[PDB]
Assembly symmetry: D2
Homo-oligomer: 363 residues x 4
């Protein structure tokens, strides 16, 4: 069977034929892979940047997948498109046992194509129906985004759950339309946060240390989103716009995220950390925590969407085809054939500028 394989924690990736007898099976339903997605986590593993590593000589890469059901089973018809949920439970703790290993208490969950579990960049795999999300054919083209968007659906749900601590966090009109969000860093993560917050009606500002890419300009225009070039810091944004109800660190590209953005966070506000710097140290002034304390601010770590969030992603992706057709059409950056080895190895190893999502097509 053809697979894309890695050997963690070391650098390197191969697209080659492997013995299917050695590849992990997770249930009874046979699924033939049609698309994979690639993200930053894949690049890190490919480049041996995930310094963590059983009877296996290699691990099948990839946790973003759409496959076709090969034979009708229970509820699944031959030809149905499915996406597998990638983080799976530790089998022990109460969160995993209710289908929510995003909140696993032991840290012993499995992550397809990352840790403990062969991923989905292979011709086909067997799965358990309970880990499959149905992908309507009417979203086949952008449906691979359901996996990364699930993370964002869970992150926003959590933010809103947290904000129930505020006796009234709605606006004069009963909505959250008056609430302002700053999305720090774009790429597929910040773009997806922006689109989802705008879906929900909140005002959004996207920020990068640069002028907008073409996709970002389309998002700005079509979703009526604002943009801030933060190349010279955030003083001008605070002076013009003021403070934000929610700030999202989407890309972890600011070594001083707290110092830079807490001053921009408004009373009762939430800073959600999704990306984070992977090296360094910075000074922490005492005024940062004093301000958090005085105004009931919260900082929350944001990670991992689960099956309900995958299903919510599907619904939103479907809505965007009608609400934001121009932007939706721009989110798949390109599709590379599994048979184009040179171009495939290139996109596995490194992002391209402006990239939102690269898909791999199985042919």
């Amino acid at each position: 069977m053809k697979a894309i394989i890695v050997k963690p924690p070391n650098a390197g990736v191969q697209v080659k034929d492997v013995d299917e007898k050695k590849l992990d099976s997770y249930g009874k339903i046979k699924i033939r892979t049609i698309y994979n997605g690639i993200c930053g986590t894949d690049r890190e593993i490919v480049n041996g940047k995930l310094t963590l590593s059983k009877g296996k000589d290699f691990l099948v890469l990839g946790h973003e997948a759409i496959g076709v059901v090969e034979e009708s089973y229970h509820g699944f018809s031959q030809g149905d498109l499915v996406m597998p949920v990638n983080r799976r439970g530790c089998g022990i703790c109460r969160n995993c046992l209710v289908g929510r290993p995003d909140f696993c208490e032991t840290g012993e969950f499995g992550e397809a194509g990352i840790h403990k579990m062969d991923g989905f960049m292979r011709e086909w795999w067997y799965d358990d129906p309970k880990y499959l999300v149905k992908i309507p054919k009417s979203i086949e083209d952008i449906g691979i985004l359901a996996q990364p968007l699930a993370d964002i659906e869970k992150s926003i749900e959590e933010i809103l759950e947290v904000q129930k601590r505020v006796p009234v966090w709605t606006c004069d009109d009963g909505t959250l339309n008056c609430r302002k969000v700053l999305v720090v860093g774009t790429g597929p993560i910040g773009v997806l946060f922006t689109l989802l917050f705008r879906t929900y009606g909140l005002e959004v500002w996207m920020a990068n240390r640069r002028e907008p890419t073409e996709v970002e300009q389309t998002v700005i225009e079509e979703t009526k989103t604002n943009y801030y070039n933060s190349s010279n810091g955030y003083d001008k944004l605070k002076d013009s716009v003021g403070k934000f109800d929610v700030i999202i660190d989407a890309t972890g590209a600011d070594v001083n995220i707290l110092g830079n953005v807490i001053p921009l966070l408004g009373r009762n506000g939430v800073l959600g950390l999704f990306g984070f710097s992977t090296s360094g140290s910075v000074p922490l002034d005492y005024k940062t925590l004093q301000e958090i304390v005085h105004t009931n601010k919260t900082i929350i770590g944001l990670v991992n969407g689960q099956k309900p969030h995958f299903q919510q992603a599907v619904v939103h992706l479907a809505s965007w085809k009608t609400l934001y057709p121009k932007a939706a059409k721009m989110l798949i950056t390109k599709t590379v054939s599994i048979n184009d080895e040179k171009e495939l190895l290139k996109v596995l190893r490194e992002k391209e500028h402006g990239e939102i999502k690269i898909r791999i097509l199985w042919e």
Copy 2:
């Protein structure tokens, strides 16, 4: 009228007779002061450490009070004991308008004896019944603690509201008894957090850079609370006990709270900041935020209890007289007469070692 008066932002305090015509009235019910409490905020103002300051030459100090209703009004009988709520609304925002200025969006709320409002260290004051909490006579002796405990009731309520984001945060027995809390710093704040968490059934560890005071030993013994001397840091506590579900920075006595305690916080855990350092800077390693992100941790600023929390305080104080009589008896450190000027000025200006709560008696 006799009052204790300050002149912010400058240092100094006087116990003297003042013209009652110039003192703030807040409604129709006449209340004769019987007790005041003193806390750290009073010491700061007295010592001109609150560097923030209208037609007034002075401000009546004090936001912790029990008074006696002077004449029967509506629902209040002559002789009834009452405590005033100290933070009051800005009159504009939606949180204030539902009686919750602890979440004020404008920051224009008033704080009795601190900012915009004469406090309650005066022979008597007029109030609005809606700002009064009924203090049962059966808790007259410790009832002054209802004000600081209200802050703690609101802080824990908020923590538990936040933890609803976790699909299951209860234990195998449906309780929170398996959940462990580290209370960093004692004094009246950390003692009250400890007693309340134990009321709720969670396991608690109190921590200071010293061996326990006598009151703390009584709490340890009577409430079955644990104790950790953190003089040499937290490594030995982590090695023996592991990690905590909630950590409370009660006293703000650690310039490196994040660095020191995030490593002790468990998956899905909450760090609640109630105290905070008032000067300095410390290094922030990147690993701190990476850990917050990976395990859905939250940091929350904790401040200000409101009327429902005052009423909850009353109920708990009543329960402690039965559940923890030894500790309850030790929480009022001493009572100083308004007529003992030397001893009164001394306790206004400085805390004593081991102090939980000093009461002023009006005679």
Copy 3:
């Protein structure tokens, strides 16, 4: 100005020119009406079935209009829908923009009570009561108003079920949860579509075989159907009990007796429609059941602006997900100038009706 007018509580309806100066204005934005929707409440008012210096009231609470000149957030040519129930100005719920929970009952209702409705050539409104309707859902966006009531109703039911320590399924979703929707028409169909969007298993029930639309819904959304002409025993035998039951149309005088035996442990009966006459025997065993198993009965009514905005998102989604069903929800469009056919549809529902639209031109 041309308007469709009524004179509550008296029966009757007229399409006539009226004096624009005596009509209610609600803000600074002039909106030219393009579509109205008609529903059951309109039929009741027109037939004088409700008791609720103006000589008439402009009818209609379902509307889409076009902003005539740019003002603050709204541009010339934007499509907008007004929120129909508005606050009493006194209570805390209305003050946070939620008169669906009004504590005084003194809220206004456009085209019903204290407020001229939207079946008129144009009206002035306040941006705060306007919901933006994307051009991409112009054809079905009139449904955002009735859909809002359903959004609110489902939200409320899910909020109530947070009382259950774990109401999710082994996979973390609500996919294992079963809903019985009693009665279709626009209300039961909208409840069905929305519950299927959320992933719950749905059974639609009526005392008859499916309509053309219903069959489309069944097939396209994988929804189940039960003919209840001879009661529900056979449904209970074959599928067992339901986690949520919705009385959509209020067309069963014995709803409690007939459906509580089909409600499962910890289950919720949501009442949206209700019978408008009569008295029926309540057995003691009904309540005994309700008590032992933490069952809840909840009256469901009125969606507010956040629900209108959620409706917009879902309608957009159904154009992609359920295109065949979505194209069948608008039953017909009647011209404001076709007086004969207009009076006929105001006065009586047509068999099979989901939503009739009035076009202004």
Copy 4:
């Protein structure tokens, strides 16, 4: 071993020596019984009013006992109370320690179903099902078991009311909210005490003037009272409508018809007791009311360990806050050795009864 035994569904009860070897053991901690409580459910079982290789079942689900030897968290001499309903081992709710929401109905109930109860000299239990009873509430701590059901019921009602955007009052509390408690006895009195603890205004109602205890509660807790012998019209005229109504004792066959007209907008009717016979006319206007105003009816049952622990806190609080009421909740104590008087109180409630305790000695 001496035990109080029954043989369900047959009527009757015996106090006799039984073979300890054939009795249920639930864990490693040996507990010597000191008190049992008796309630309505016990009277029903003894009179064979429930249909629910053992020849008998040990009766009793309300107990306090003393730990005989130290084991893990529990020391020799600690007072403990067992949680009486235990999980089915299959469903997600039971698996998170909440069989009050058991989805299979296959949970065990001590002294009722699948589990020997606690009216026996001693039993073995698992620390996970034991609630610590402080020595300082030994005299009234037997009430922690029925109080737990009330803790859970009020918690559930407040959870449900989070659906209301603002259900608090102008002062941020629930002080403005009014509760009508229909029926007293141990259930209505406990509901009353607990709602007053939370600060809500309470009216107790019965078809009679107050008992001695009730008058003490009225005065000491500032609770209101209504004689409902001639219906509730005069209550509605004088006070208006209620935000929460609790049917505590199920002693009104027309509860819905009689109290829904007294339930206010967004209000909740919580059903704890229920009628055990009969059929009554349900008018259509009842549901119409429920629908227009977001009313909810909720069946209330069974508290679990967190509720037992909350009960302990509140009982401790009432010793300080409401000492006179608290000293009147234990109606009498009957010796396990006074067989005549013991059989009499197992078989029938006494007039005025709140709680009868059995003492083991």
